[PDB]
């Protein structure tokens, strides 16, 4: 022990607890902004994926590489991550779930190509040894589709030059203000698994001039809209995970303060009794 050094640790742990409470303030306010942005993005992206779901199934079928269920030689992943710490295990759990699926393909001899949207992903997969084919980092408090397009444009080129056969986005879902889960979502090869449009089977879809250029443009927009929503939702998940972590760090700091104080009080009492005993013995 030691009265001054313990009192110094008590001072430092006190101020750290006060900071983690303020960080919990910044994390909640940013969660408010991030989730209302998500709430705005959700209708447009949800209806765009519905639109393509109608195009999935119904006649007057033109034939297009993103539409058919071709065979899998290699698989693409778009991976979103944070660039920051103090978000608990959100990135670790997502990276582990991806590593499990990539292992399952590597059992099949199917290679994985990875595009990273955050610095934590770049660091982890480069140092683990996933083939990072694209990467952007440090998007900012307000992320914008424009910067995110380039990595996607690379993954699109890898698919449309025919190398890359299946493509996924992996991201965390903002299931609730206090509950989220990592998900791997099938992305560009339009799953015929989706419901047949039997409910309006009167319609066989028909086209304005050049269905190829129009449909190509529309699918470009679909893929991008899916990536933009998946990023905005992962940022809302990040702010929720940070606020939960800072709340835990605040309670653990209080728990240390209440125990260091007991060490300090016992030490001051012993110091006060070692002296006095020695002054009375010396007074003799």
Q: How many CA atoms are closer than 13 Å to the CA of 54, on its beta-carbon side?
A: 13
15 belongs to the binding site for another protein (CB under 8 A): no
Number of amino acids touching another protein (CB under 8 A): 43
Of 112-120, 175-183, 246-254, 276-284, the segment contacting another protein by CB under 8 A is 246-254
Q: Does 253 bind another protein (CB under 8 A)?
A: yes
Q: Does 217 bind another protein (CB under 8 A)?
A: yes
How crowded is the C-beta side of 208, counted as CA atoms within 13 Å? 4
**DSSP structure class, residue 198:** G
Q: Using the rule CB under 8 A, is 161 a contact of another protein?
A: no
Residue 168, strand partner residues:
77, 186
Secondary structure (DSSP) of 179-190: EEEEEEEE-SS-
Q: Phi and psi of 67, rounded to 5°?
A: -85, -45
Q: How far apart are CA 252 and CA 230, in angstroms?
A: 33
Give how far the C-alpha of residue 137 lies from the chain's centroid of Cα atoms, to the nearest Å.
13
The site string for another protein over 67-106 (x = CB under 8 A, - otherwise) reads ------------------xx-xx--x--------------
Q: Using the rule CB under 8 A, is 252 a contact of another protein?
A: yes
Q: Which residues bind another protein (CB under 8 A)?
A: 13, 16, 40-41, 43-45, 47-48, 50-51, 54-55, 58, 85-86, 88-89, 92, 145, 197, 200, 202-208, 211, 214-215, 217-218, 221, 225, 228, 245, 248-249, 252-253, 256
């Amino acid at each position: 022990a030691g009265a001054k050094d313990i009192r110094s640790k008590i001072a430092s742990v006190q101020n750290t607890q006060k900071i983690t409470k303020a960080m919990e303030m910044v994390a909640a306010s940013k969660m408010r902004k991030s989730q209302d942005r998500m709430a705005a993005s959700r209708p447009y992206a949800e209806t765009m994926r519905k639109v393509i779901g109608h195009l999935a199934h119904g006649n007057l079928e033109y034939k297009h590489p993103y539409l058919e269920d071709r065979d899998v030689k290699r698989v693409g992943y778009l991976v979103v991550s944070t660039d920051r710490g103090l978000a608990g295990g959100l990135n670790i759990n997502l990276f582990k779930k991806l590593l499990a699926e990539m292992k399952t393909w590597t059992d099949k001899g199917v290679q994985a190509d990875l595009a990273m949207i955050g610095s934590k992903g770049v660091s982890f997969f480069n140092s683990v040894g996933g083939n990072v084919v694209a990467q952007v980092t440090g998007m900012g408090d307000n992320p914008s589709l424009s910067e995110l397009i380039g990595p996607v444009k690379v993954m699109l080129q890898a698919y449309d030059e025919g190398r890359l056969d299946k493509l996924y986005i992996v991201s965390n879902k903002f299931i609730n203000t206090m509950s989220q889960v990592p998900t791997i979502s099938q992305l560009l090869p339009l799953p015929a698994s989706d419901d047949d449009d039997l409910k309006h089977k009167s319609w066989d879809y028909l086209y304005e001039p050049d269905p190829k250029a129009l449909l190509d443009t529309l699918l470009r927009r679909y893929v991008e809209s899916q990536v933009y929503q998946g990023v905005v939702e992962n940022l809302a998940s990040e702010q929720a995970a940070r606020m939960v972590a800072m709340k835990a760090a605040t309670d653990n700091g209080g728990s240390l303060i209440k125990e260091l104080q007991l060490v300090y009080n016992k030490a001051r009492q012993a110091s006060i009794t070692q002296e006095l005993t020695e002054i009375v013995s010396g007074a003799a």
